[PDB]
Amino acid sequence: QNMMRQKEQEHMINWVEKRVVQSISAQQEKETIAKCIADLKLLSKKAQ
Amino acid sequence: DPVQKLFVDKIREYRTKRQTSGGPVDAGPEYQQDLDRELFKLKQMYGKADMNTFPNFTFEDP
Amino acid sequence: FAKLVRPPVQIYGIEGRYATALYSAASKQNKLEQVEKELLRVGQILKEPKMAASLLNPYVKRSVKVKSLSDMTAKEKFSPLTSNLINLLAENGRLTNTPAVISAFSTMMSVHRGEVPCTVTTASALDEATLTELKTVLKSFLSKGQVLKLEVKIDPSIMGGMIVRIGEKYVDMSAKTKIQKLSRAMRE
Amino acid sequence: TTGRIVAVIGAVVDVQFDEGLPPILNALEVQGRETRLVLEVAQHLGESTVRTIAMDGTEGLVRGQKVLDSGAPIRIPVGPETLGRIMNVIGEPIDERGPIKTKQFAAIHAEAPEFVEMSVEQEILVTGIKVVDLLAPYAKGGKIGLFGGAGVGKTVLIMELINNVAKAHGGYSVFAGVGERTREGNDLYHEMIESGVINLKDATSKVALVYGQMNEPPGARARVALTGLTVAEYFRDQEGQDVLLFIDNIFRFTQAGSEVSALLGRIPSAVGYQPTLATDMGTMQERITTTKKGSITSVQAIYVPADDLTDPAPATTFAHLDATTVLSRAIAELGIYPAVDPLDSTSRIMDPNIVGSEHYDVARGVQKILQDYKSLQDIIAILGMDELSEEDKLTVSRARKIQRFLSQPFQVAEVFTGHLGKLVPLKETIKGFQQILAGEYDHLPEQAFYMVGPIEEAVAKADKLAE
Amino acid sequence: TTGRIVAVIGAVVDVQFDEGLPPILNALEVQGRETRLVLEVAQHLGESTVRTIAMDGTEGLVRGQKVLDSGAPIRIPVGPETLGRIMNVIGEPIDERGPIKTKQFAAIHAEAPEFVEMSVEQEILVTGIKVVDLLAPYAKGGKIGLFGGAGVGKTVLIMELINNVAKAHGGYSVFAGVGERTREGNDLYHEMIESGVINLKDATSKVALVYGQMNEPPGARARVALTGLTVAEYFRDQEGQDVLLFIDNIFRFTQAGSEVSALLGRIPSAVGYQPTLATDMGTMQERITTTKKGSITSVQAIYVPADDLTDPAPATTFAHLDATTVLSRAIAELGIYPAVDPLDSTSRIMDPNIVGSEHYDVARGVQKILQDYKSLQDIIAILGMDELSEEDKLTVSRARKIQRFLSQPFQVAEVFTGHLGKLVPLKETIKGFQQILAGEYDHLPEQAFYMVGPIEEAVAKADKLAEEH
Amino acid sequence: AEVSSILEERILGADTSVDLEETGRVLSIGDGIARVHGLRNVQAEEMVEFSSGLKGMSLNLEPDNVGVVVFGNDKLIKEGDIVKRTGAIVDVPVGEELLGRVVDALGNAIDGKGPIGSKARRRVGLKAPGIIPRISVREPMQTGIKAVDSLVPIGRGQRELIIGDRQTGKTSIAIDTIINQKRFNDGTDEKKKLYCIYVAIGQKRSTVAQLVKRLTDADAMKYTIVVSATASDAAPLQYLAPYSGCSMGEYFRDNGKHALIIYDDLSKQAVAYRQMSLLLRRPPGREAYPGDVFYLHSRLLERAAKMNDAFGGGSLTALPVIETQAGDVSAYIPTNVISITDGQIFLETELFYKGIRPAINVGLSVSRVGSAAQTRAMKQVAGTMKLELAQYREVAAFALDAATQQLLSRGVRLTELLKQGQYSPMAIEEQVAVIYAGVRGYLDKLEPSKITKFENAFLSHVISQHQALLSKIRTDGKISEESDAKLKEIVTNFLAGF
Ligand SMILES: Nc1ncnc2c1ncn2[C@@H]1O[C@H](COP(=O)(O)OP(=O)(O)OP(=O)(O)O)[C@@H](O)[C@H]1O
Ligand SMILES: Nc1ncnc2c1ncn2[C@@H]1O[C@H](COP(=O)(O)OP(=O)(O)O)[C@@H](O)[C@H]1O
Ligand SMILES: Nc1ncnc2c1ncn2[C@@H]1O[C@H](COP(=O)(O)OP(=O)(O)O)[C@@H](O)[C@H]1O
Ligand SMILES: [Mg+2]
Ligand SMILES: [Mg+2]
Ligand SMILES: [Mg+2]
C-alpha cells in the first residue's frame, strides 16, 4: 500500500507540473503586469 | 488568496486529475514495468507463502 | 598622507585603485565632469588601431610610450589631471587595462550623480504604458534625487510574471519561481 | 552556443562564451578536429570564461578555435547492446565492430542513491580462495578492495576472481579498466572471447568492457570510472539485475585528478594531492552501492604508492569498502601467493551471526596464532629460535604451517608456474585450518602445505616428500 | 576615531579608517554587538586599512560595521579588588558577581624590565616534593617550567604546588589559565573556594584568576597570558610584595599565535609555526621577572606536542626558565608519580655553593646511579638478571629503590590513588636518599619505598608488608 | 483517493509572501565555492540561498566579494546567478521531535517519514557554557562494556575519546553505549534517561543504514537521533554536521535533560574543513590543514558540559572518535584531540587479533574523573581488579614460584573476564557480579579457555534465580555485607556446579 501511495504520488507530481507548464503560456499579460505593479507599489509603501 | 492565479491553476489541474484518475493516466508502459519489478522484488524479500490466507504448521514434538 | 575623499561606490583591483586616485584628485579642485569627459575622449583616442597597435607592443620602450602619450595629450588640450593620469598609467605599464580604468570611473561617477541601475526581466516585451507605471513605482523605491537607470531584458526561460533588480534589492514575481516553490513544498 | 578557446595549458582548456554560458559538467565539442575532442566543463571563472578538462589529446588546439556547447553532460550508450563491446570515456566503441546501437543514453554524472534506497542484506560470496574465504570473507552486493603495491598480485587475483565468481554468475558483468596496461586489456578481451563470455556473432555476451588505459591523458583516466559506473548502474536500476563491477586500477582515478587539479589553480593538499580528494572519491564510490532496485558486487584493485598505506589515497579508500584484502610485498617475497596479509585484511561479515561459529572461531584462532608469531618474529630474528620456550616453538611451527597453507595455486597462474589451479570450498578450508590448529599435523614438514588445495593434498605431498 | 570593517576572514578583521589611523596594538570596539567584541590592531596595510585580531567570535559582523578606537591598548582593571574574581582577556568579569570596581586600569602591553633592574640572588624554594627538592630545586623569584606531553601530571603537579606554596604564602597569587579545559577552570575555582584562598564573603581573597580557556578564538588565547601577566606585574610593582604566577599552559599562547599568522600574511617557519615564534615568546617571558622592586615566582606548564622535547615551542621555552621539571610518560607508565624525569630536569641553583655540599652530592649520586641503571638495562635485556656481577645487582637494587622513593602521594591526588598526601621537609629527603645510597636499607624490599613520604614511612610500610606476609 | 487529497493539503498552505530581499551575482563558481558580488550587508557565517533553492554559508567577507560555500551539489550554480541573503546565522531544528529521525547535517529528514515537527531552532556556532554554570561530573554514564565501566569509567559531562586504527571496534563501542541506555530510558525516573545523538561523518550511506537498522532491531531509535553527513555530501556539510548534532544535544542539556553525542569520526570533519579552507584560498598549514584546526575541535568539544542544578542540571557527554594511521597516535589531529578531551580509550590491532575484544588498551586508557562517576559497587571491585591487572602487566612478557605464578593466573583470568560480544551491553550490577566472581580467587581453579563459558552461564543463572540480589545491588548501589555474603555463597555453589 505504501509503495502504491508514493508511486501514484510521484506520477501525480509530474502530471500536474506538466499541465501547469503548458497552461502558463496562456494570455494573462496585461492583468499580470497590472497586479505586479500593484505589488511593487505596496512593497514600496512598506519599504520607506 | 483568490489572487494567486497559479495557486488556483495547480488546484484546478489537481481536481482534473482526481476526476480522470479512473485509471492511471499517461501511465505508459513504464508504469507497468516498474510496478511489476518492485512487486516482484518485494515478493522475494517477504516470501513465497500462500498469498491468500494463513499457512498451516503441523509442528513436531521433541 | 593626504586624506583622499572616498568615492561613493568602491571599485576594487588595479583599475579600482587608479580610478579611486583619479576620483580623489578630481573631487578636490572640483573637476569631476570635465575629467569624465576627457576620460571618455581618451577612450576613443587610444582605441585608434595605430595607437592601440603601438601601445600593446611591450617592446617599444616605456620612454617612447610616455613621449607619444604626452604628445597626444598636448595635441588634445587636456586637464593636467587626465594628462598626469595617462602618464602614470604609462609609466607603470598599466595601459592594457586603461579601458578598465575608464569603465571604473564611469561606474564611480554614475553613482556620484545619483543613479541606481535597474533591471526588469519578463517572458515577453511590454506596452509603454505599463513601462511608465513601472518607472513611477521604481522611482518610488528610490530615495530623493536618485535618478533611475532602467534596463528591460526579455527572458523567455521564465514562464511569465516579472523580475526586478534595483541595486541589490530583488523582487521575483515570476511564474517559474512560484512553480518551483509549489512543486517543492508539495513534494514534501 | 559557441565560444572560443582562450587558453590551452596541458589538458585544461579555457573557453570564452559571449552568449549563454554552459553549466558545470556540461560537455563541449571542439569544432575543427580530425576526431571528436570533448571538453567537460569544470568551473566558471567570471568574465564569461569556463575552465574545462579535455577528454583527449589537446595538441593542435589554436587560441581562438571554436567550441560548440552540447547542452548535456557526456552521455554514453547504455543497454543490453553494450555487452560484448569495448567502450571508451565518451562511449565510442573501440573494438572496430560498428556503432553501439542503443535507444537510450545515460549521463555519466548522475547523483548517488538516497538514504531510503540502501539495502541492509549481508550474505557471503564464496570465491574458492582459502585466505579470502577464511579471514576476510567477501560479501554479496558489497564493495571489495584489493590493496597492493606494484607487482604483488592485484591483477592476478582479480582475474582469478573474474574466472571463479563470474563463471558461476548468471547476471551481467562490467569490467572498467582505468589506468592499466593496454596489453592486459587485450589479453582480457581475448580470454573472454575464447571462454565464451563474449560472442562476437550472437547476443549472449555477459560482460561489458570499458577502457581508459594508461596511455590516455589525465582527463580520460579521471572520467572513465564514471562510464563503467553508468554502464553498471543501468543494469542495476532499469534491468533490475545483479551486476559484477570489476575496476582495475581505481587509484588511477584519483591520481589523474591530481594531474588536472594542479592546472586548475587549486592549492595542493597533504602530498601534492588535490584538495578535493575525499569528496571526489566519495561521489564516485557512493554510486557503486547495492540499493533496493538491484545489486552491484564491485571489486576494485587499489594501488598503494611506494607501498605506503599511510598515503591519502588508499587511506581514504579504506572507508568505502566492506571487505579489504591487503596484498603485501613481504609475503610475496616469501613465495606465498596470493600475498594477502591475513592481519591487514578485514571484512564486515566476519560476524559469528553471519559466517557461523566454527568459521568465526577458526578465523580468530588463525589470526591469534599469526599475531603471536608476529610478536615473536623480532626476537626470533636476532636471538635465534633457540631462546624460545616450548609453547613458543609450537606457536612458531603452527604459525608457519598456517602461513604456508594460506597459499594457493590459481588457475590464472597455470601458465606462470605449471601447477594446476585449485578451488577450495569453504567447508574444506575451515576443516583444514581446524586440523592444523588442533595440532593434528605437527608431524608433517611445513613445506608440505606450500601451494596445495585442501589439506588432504598437503598430506599427500608430505607422503611424497618421504620418498 | 571611527573606522569601518571592510573584511572578515576567520578571526582576522580588516578595518578601514577615514581619519587618522590607530597605532599598532590599540584596542578597537565594534559598534552594534550585543556583547563586547574587542579587536586588537596588528598591522597597518596601507590605504588606511589596519588588520586586527578579534578577541571574541567574529560571527554576525557585517562589512561596514562602525568601529571605535579606544586610543590605548587593552586596559584591564588592576588592584586588590581583582583578588577572588575571574576575568577575560579584556578584563571584564566572568564570575557572575558584579563589576570589578578599581581605580587603576593597566594596559596589557608593556616593555620588559631593563638590564639595570635584574636581581641576581637565588635561594631555594622548598616545595615539599621529593624529586623537585632533591634534583631540580626551585628558587624564590625564579621562573619554573613543567614540561611534558598530555596526561603526565602537569595540571596535577601545578595544583599540588598551589596547594602547598600558595596556601602558606603571605604575598598574593595569580592564576592565568591559558587555553585549557574549562572543566579544570571550574574545578580550580571550587577547590580554591573550599580551601579558602578565594573568599566570596569578605575581602580576604589571596588569588586573582584570569581565564582564556580553549573555547575562545585564537585572539583571546594569545592575550590572556598578557592579562594575567599584567595583574601579576601590578602586584609586583605597586604593592611592592612577593607574587606567585601560575600559567597553564604557556604553549597555548604560542599555538594561538600560530593559528592566525598565516591569515596575517606571514610565511610559515620550520613546522607550521609563525616566523615570530621566538620574538613573540620573548616579549612575554621577559616581563615575568624578579626585578629589584618586586619578586614574581612564575610556574609555567608547557605542553610538549607528542612528547617531542625538540619541537620548536618547548625547545625555545627552555631558554627562558631557571628550573625545569621534565615530566616523562615513560616514567608515568611505571606508576611513579609525579613522573618527573630525574635525568632530564635541571635547576640553576643546583650548585654546591647555593644548596650545600651534602645536598649537591646526594643529588649527583642519585643521578649517577640512575644513569648507570639505564646503562645496565641494555645488558639485562640479553643476559638476564641472574647473570649480572654480584656488584651490578646491588646497583640495580639501589636504582630501583631510588626510582620508587621519588614517587610521592599528593594531597590533590587522593581521588586517584586513595592514599594521603605527604609533605617531606628538605632535610628528610636528603637523609632518605643519602641512606638509600649508603646501603642502610639494602634489605627492605623495593615496594616498601613506593608512594611514601620520609624514609621512616618506608620502614613502617615494609614492617606492615612483612607482618601480613 | 486520499493520496491526492493529502497531496493537495500541501499546496493549500503555501508561501505567498514575496519580499524585497538583498542579493548578489555569482562572479565565479567552481569546486563547491562561489564568489558572490553584492550582498553588502551579509553577515559572517550567515546562511544565504541560491536561485535553485540550494543553501550556502558566507564564510569569507572580502572587500570585493563574498566567499560562499554551497551546502550541496555545485553543478546547478551558474555565473551571473542570484544569491539571496536569508539574514540568519546557520541554525538547525532542535527538540524531542527529532528523536528516532535520521537527518542530514542541516536538520532535513533523510529517511522519508515526513518532516520534522521542531518548534525551535538553535545556532550551530554557539559559545560554550562559561566557567560558572558547570559543576564537577557526578553521575556515571553506563556504557555496558565491562572494560570501560570498570577500568576507564565515563561520567556524564565528560568528553571521552575513542582513538584507534581502522577496524578495531570503535563504532562498536559507540553502538553498545547507545544500546545500553535502553534500560534506563524504558524506566520511570527521568534523572537516568539519556538521549543519544550519533553524528556520522564521512561514512558511506550503507554503513549508516546498517547502523540505523541495528539500532532499530535493539529498539534504540526511540531516543536516538542520527545526523548523517556521508561521503557524498559536499564538504561544507561534513564540516557542519558535528556542530548541528552538538546543538541538538545542547538543547537537551539546556532543558534539564541528559544527552550523549558521538562524533564519528572527527578525523573526517578535519579533512572536510581542510578542503573548504583550501578552496577558499586560505593559506595551508601543517599537513595542509588550516591553522584553525585545533580551534575547530576545541570549540566543538567544549560544549559537552555538566550544568549545575541552577541551570537545569542537564548534561551532554561526548565520545569523539579519531582514527590513527598504523597506531601513530603522535599525528597532528590525534594529538590535538587528545589534548582537548578528558579521557581516552586506546584500541589496538595487536590486541584485536590476539583475541582481546574490545581491544581497549587498559594500560594507556585514562579517565580524569576516575573515582567520581562510578557506582560504589564498581568502585569497590574494579579497584582491586585494576591493581591486579597493573601488577600482572609488569610480569607478563614471559610464561615459577607459587606467588608470581598465581599472580599471572589471576591476571589471565581477569583478562579473559573482560572480553565481550557485540551489541550485548551488561547491566552494571551484572558486571559487578562477574568481576567480583573473577577477582575473588574463584576462577583461579578453572582453565583460562573456559572463562567465557563460566561468565555466560553464570550470567544466565543469576539473571533468573537471583534477580532479587541484582535488584538489591542496583537499588542500594553497593555491595553491603549481606550482599557480599550472598554473592559469596552463590559463586561458591555455582563454581562447583559447573
Ligand atoms: N567486542 C567485539 N567482539 C567481536 N568482534 C568485534 C568486537 N568489536 C568489534 N568487532 C569486529 O570489528 C569489526 C569492525 O568494527 P567497528 O566498525 O566497530 O570498528 P571501526 O574501527 O569503527 O571500523 P571503521 O573504522 O572501518 O568504521 C566488526 O566487523 C566487528 O565484527
Ligand atoms: N597465484 C599466483 N601464483 C604465482 N605467482 C603469482 C600469483 N599471483 C601473483 N603472482 C605474482 O604476481 C606477479 C604479477 O603481478 P600483478 O598482480 O600483475 O602486478 P600488479 O600488482 O601491478 O597488478 C607475477 O609475476 C607473479 O609472480
Ligand atoms: N600525582 C598523581 N598520582 C596519581 N595519578 C596521577 C597523578 N598526577 C596525574 N595523574 C594521572 O594523570 C591524570 C591527570 O593528568 P593531568 O596532569 O591532568 O594531565 P596533563 O598533565 O596532561 O594536563 C589523572 O587521570 C591521573 O590518573
Ligand atoms: Mg595489474
Ligand atoms: Mg592540563
Ligand atoms: Mg566505524
Short mmCIF file of C-alpha atoms in Angstrom, two decimals, chain F residues 56-183:
data_model
loop_
_atom_site.label_atom_id
_atom_site.label_comp_id
_atom_site.label_asym_id
_atom_site.label_seq_id
_atom_site.Cartn_x
_atom_site.Cartn_y
_atom_site.Cartn_z
CA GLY F 56 25.17 28.07 1.39
CA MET F 57 27.22 29.83 4.04
CA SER F 58 29.01 33.15 3.59
CA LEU F 59 32.35 32.20 5.11
CA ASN F 60 34.71 34.81 3.60
CA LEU F 61 33.91 38.52 3.67
CA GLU F 62 36.48 40.08 1.40
CA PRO F 63 36.23 43.73 0.35
CA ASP F 64 35.32 42.92 -3.26
CA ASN F 65 33.35 39.66 -2.98
CA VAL F 66 31.85 37.20 -0.51
CA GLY F 67 33.20 33.66 -0.49
CA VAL F 68 30.23 31.32 -0.09
CA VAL F 69 30.35 27.55 0.46
CA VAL F 70 27.47 25.58 -1.05
CA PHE F 71 25.61 23.12 1.20
CA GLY F 72 25.01 20.63 -1.57
CA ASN F 73 25.85 19.92 -5.17
CA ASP F 74 27.55 22.57 -7.27
CA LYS F 75 26.68 21.76 -10.89
CA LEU F 76 23.43 23.74 -10.70
CA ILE F 77 25.01 27.13 -9.89
CA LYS F 78 25.98 29.22 -12.91
CA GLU F 79 27.81 32.50 -13.29
CA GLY F 80 25.62 35.55 -13.05
CA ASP F 81 23.23 33.64 -10.81
CA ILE F 82 21.42 35.26 -7.87
CA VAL F 83 22.23 34.73 -4.19
CA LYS F 84 19.64 35.98 -1.69
CA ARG F 85 20.68 36.53 1.91
CA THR F 86 18.33 34.90 4.42
CA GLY F 87 19.52 37.14 7.25
CA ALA F 88 20.09 34.37 9.78
CA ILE F 89 23.24 32.70 11.06
CA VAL F 90 23.29 29.00 10.25
CA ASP F 91 20.92 27.18 12.60
CA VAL F 92 19.26 23.79 12.88
CA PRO F 93 15.96 22.49 14.30
CA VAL F 94 16.04 21.17 17.85
CA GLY F 95 13.63 19.36 20.13
CA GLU F 96 12.28 15.95 21.07
CA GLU F 97 10.59 15.91 17.67
CA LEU F 98 13.92 14.78 16.18
CA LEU F 99 14.21 11.59 18.25
CA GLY F 100 14.14 8.48 16.09
CA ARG F 101 14.69 10.51 12.91
CA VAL F 102 17.64 10.26 10.56
CA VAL F 103 18.51 13.79 9.46
CA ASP F 104 21.24 15.35 7.35
CA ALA F 105 23.76 17.87 8.60
CA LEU F 106 21.21 20.69 8.20
CA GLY F 107 18.32 19.03 10.03
CA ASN F 108 16.39 17.79 7.00
CA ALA F 109 14.69 14.43 7.39
CA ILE F 110 16.58 11.84 5.35
CA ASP F 111 14.53 8.65 5.86
CA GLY F 112 11.26 9.92 4.40
CA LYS F 113 8.89 9.50 7.35
CA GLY F 114 7.55 13.02 6.79
CA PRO F 115 9.06 16.27 8.06
CA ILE F 116 10.42 17.29 11.46
CA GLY F 117 7.90 18.99 13.72
CA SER F 118 10.54 21.03 15.51
CA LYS F 119 9.22 24.24 17.07
CA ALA F 120 12.62 25.78 17.83
CA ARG F 121 15.89 26.46 16.04
CA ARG F 122 19.37 26.81 17.51
CA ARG F 123 22.51 28.35 16.04
CA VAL F 124 25.25 25.83 15.32
CA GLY F 125 28.02 28.26 16.23
CA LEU F 126 27.15 28.97 19.86
CA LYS F 127 29.71 29.67 22.56
CA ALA F 128 30.42 27.00 25.14
CA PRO F 129 28.97 27.41 28.64
CA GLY F 130 31.04 29.58 30.92
CA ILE F 131 33.07 28.51 33.93
CA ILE F 132 30.31 29.16 36.49
CA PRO F 133 27.37 27.16 35.04
CA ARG F 134 29.25 23.86 35.11
CA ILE F 135 29.64 21.51 38.06
CA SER F 136 32.02 18.61 38.57
CA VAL F 137 30.94 15.35 36.94
CA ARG F 138 28.93 13.26 39.40
CA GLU F 139 26.74 10.60 37.78
CA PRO F 140 28.10 7.61 35.86
CA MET F 141 27.49 7.17 32.13
CA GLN F 142 26.79 3.46 31.83
CA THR F 143 28.47 2.16 28.69
CA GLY F 144 27.82 -1.57 29.06
CA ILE F 145 31.35 -2.67 28.19
CA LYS F 146 32.94 -4.28 31.23
CA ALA F 147 36.41 -2.95 30.45
CA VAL F 148 35.11 0.62 30.05
CA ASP F 149 32.71 0.68 33.00
CA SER F 150 35.35 -0.87 35.27
CA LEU F 151 38.81 0.34 34.22
CA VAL F 152 38.19 3.60 32.32
CA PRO F 153 34.83 4.85 33.64
CA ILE F 154 32.98 7.68 31.91
CA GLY F 155 30.84 10.24 33.72
CA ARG F 156 28.07 12.46 32.41
CA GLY F 157 29.55 15.68 31.10
CA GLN F 158 32.91 14.05 30.43
CA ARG F 159 34.45 14.03 26.94
CA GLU F 160 35.97 10.62 26.31
CA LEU F 161 37.96 9.92 23.16
CA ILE F 162 37.80 6.61 21.30
CA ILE F 163 41.02 6.53 19.30
CA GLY F 164 42.41 3.65 17.31
CA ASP F 165 43.18 2.33 13.87
CA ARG F 166 40.70 1.30 11.20
CA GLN F 167 38.55 -1.71 12.12
CA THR F 168 39.43 -2.13 15.79
CA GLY F 169 35.94 -1.71 17.22
CA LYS F 170 35.28 1.99 17.80
CA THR F 171 31.83 2.28 16.25
CA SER F 172 31.06 -0.95 18.09
CA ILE F 173 31.75 0.75 21.42
CA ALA F 174 29.62 3.70 20.32
CA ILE F 175 26.71 1.43 19.39
CA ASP F 176 26.99 -0.54 22.62
CA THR F 177 26.83 2.70 24.59
CA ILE F 178 23.78 3.80 22.60
CA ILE F 179 22.00 0.47 23.02
CA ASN F 180 22.69 0.14 26.74
CA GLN F 181 20.70 3.29 27.55
CA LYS F 182 17.54 1.38 26.64
CA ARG F 183 17.12 0.02 30.17
#
